[PDB]
Amino acid sequence: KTVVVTTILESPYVMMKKNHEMLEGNERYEGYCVDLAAEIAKHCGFKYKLTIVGDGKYGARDADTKIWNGMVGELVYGKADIAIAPLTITLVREEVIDFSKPFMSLGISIMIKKGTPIESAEDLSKQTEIAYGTLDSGSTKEFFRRSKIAVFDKMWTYMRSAEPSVFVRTTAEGVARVRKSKGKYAYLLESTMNEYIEQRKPCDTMKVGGNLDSKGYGIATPKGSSLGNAVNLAVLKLNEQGLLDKLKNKWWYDKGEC
Amino acid sequence: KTVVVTTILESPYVMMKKNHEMLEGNERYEGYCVDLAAEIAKHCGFKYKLTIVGDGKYGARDADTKIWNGMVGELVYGKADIAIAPLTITLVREEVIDFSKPFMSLGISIMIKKGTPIESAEDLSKQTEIAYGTLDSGSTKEFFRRSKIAVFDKMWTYMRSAEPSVFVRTTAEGVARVRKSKGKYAYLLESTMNEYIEQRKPCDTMKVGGNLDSKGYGIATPKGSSLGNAVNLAVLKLNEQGLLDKLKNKWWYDKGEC
Ligand SMILES: [Zn+2]
Ligand SMILES: [Zn+2]
Ligand SMILES: [Zn+2]
């Protein structure tokens, strides 16, 4: 049967082609994950259908109702057979779904509007003129919520109680907030996304400091899935052949605008 | 039952303490992996015994007998229950043993004396005045042997027929060869080790250029191991607590002598 792939509209991973209205099925999309999905499918030997997650979220469990949302939820409840997106491998998720070895290594980072007098997470924590937040319903927000590290705990204490909210629904919203903040808002997002945006016009943002942590993205399948083993081996084969590095160069720098 | 842990003497992962002669069992050793093993055994609640792999190798398969050597072999043939060391996650290994999600991210790098006229892998493949090689029976040598990239392929053709042999049995021998070669020898090793040595006196070596690839080290268990699942979650939990970063700081720079 055709494999249902859940993914998310997050540039440069998955995007609508300029003339998608003229196209059909998988041909409507382009991007790093679109390219990766085609390769994984070929090496594993399956036909697939790309679908954008309904609620546009990555995946988090709701305490009380205990219902998983986002791409994780589509896998948990059987709405999708595999997730190919910039989905962070975390303990809570690994407890309900399977992840292949990582296809991309990254870490949480700081995005500022050029000129902002901030160079580290410690800098953000010791001041208050500049506000900062993260994406909502994701691994980045969870990192700070659960952190027992002094600096990060101090950062979370502030963010969770900040008003108006410093959190955003999508990466694009966070980037826009930084650009129009006149330097009064710094955004906390994963390094890969930070690096991508720094190469996009109007070239007014920049990544500062070292990553706050280290983790990776993995292809996810429902627990006990028949595709798990093959997909994992495919990811390892493709990394060792250099495809993964080739794809990042293609979507990040080959198309750099700065 | 006490869990048999196979490991390898490789600074700063596993080393004999200064006063090892008056110590017994696991107390004779110290290092990053020694600390990691203790952490894992505590969260999974099991007793263990650290053992140094008999042949001192990481793990490669004999093309003729098809027999696995090193730590991988000890797991494959049931001589050990788990391997906790800087063992690289690779396709060929993943096919015969299980790996937890990575506990450390790294890549192949270039080590030069200091003052050596080399700044990249390309530079090495352009001349013949400077010899270069890699460790044996490992993931690094296999990287060059199978590479399809023009530069890495040009390098392997040289290393495969080089006379004398540019390959070493241990990282220690490679480093020693760079130091006593007047800069006429360059060593190819994983970034983690490179960075560690660069901070060790006589402080006469340095890492140059970016990593050639991106991979990770993982805790290995035989296939069908009752410890596999739990250990994998243990690694994720530890990374999220910051323990893994804490440990690298401790053994890499806190003890730095440059
Ligand atoms: Zn392919
Ligand atoms: Zn602990
Ligand atoms: Zn043989």
Swiss-Prot record, chains A, B:
The record marks I118 as: Crucial to convey clamshell closure to channel opening. The modification Phosphoserine is found at S147, S181. Palmitoylated. Depalmitoylated upon L-glutamate stimulation. Ubiquitinated by RNF167, leading to its degradation. Changing N239D: Increases rate of desensitization. Induction: Down-regulated in the pyramidal cell layer of CA1 in the hippocampus by global ischemia. L-glutamate binds at P86, T88, R93, S139, T140, E190. Disulfide bonds join C203-C258. Residues 117-258 are extracellular. It is found in: Cell membrane; Postsynaptic cell membrane; Postsynaptic density membrane. Detected in forebrain. Detected in dendrites of neuronal cells. Expressed in the pyramidal cell layers of CA1 and CA3 and in the granule cell layer of the dentate gyrus. The record marks R61, R145, K237 as: Interaction with the cone snail toxin Con-ikot-ikot. Homotetramer or heterotetramer of pore-forming glutamate receptor subunits. Tetramers may be formed by the dimerization of dimers. May interact with MPP4. Forms a ternary complex with GRIP1 and CSPG4. Interacts with ATAD1 in an ATP-dependent manner. ATAD1-catalyzed ATP hydrolysis disrupts binding to ATAD1 and to GRIP1 and leads to AMPAR complex disassembly. Interacts with GRIP2. Interacts with GRIP1. Interacts with NSF via its C-terminus. Interacts with CACNG2, PICK1 and GRIP2. Interacts with GRIA1 and SYNDIG1. Part of a complex containing GRIA2, NSF and NAPA and/or NAPB. Belongs to the glutamate-gated ion channel (TC 1.A.10.1) family. GRIA2 subfamily. The M4 transmembrane segment mediates tetramerization and is required for cell surface expression. Ionotropic glutamate receptor that functions as a ligand-gated cation channel, gated by L-glutamate and glutamatergic agonists such as alpha-amino-3-hydroxy-5-methyl-4-isoxazolepropionic acid (AMPA), quisqualic acid, and kainic acid. L-glutamate acts as an excitatory neurotransmitter at many synapses in the central nervous system and plays an important role in fast excitatory synaptic transmission. The postsynaptic actions of L-glutamate are mediated by a variety of receptors that are named according to their selective agonists. This receptor binds AMPA (quisqualate) > L-glutamate > kainate. This is Glutamate receptor 2. It comes from Rattus norvegicus (Rat). The chain holds residues 414 to 794 of 883 of the full protein.
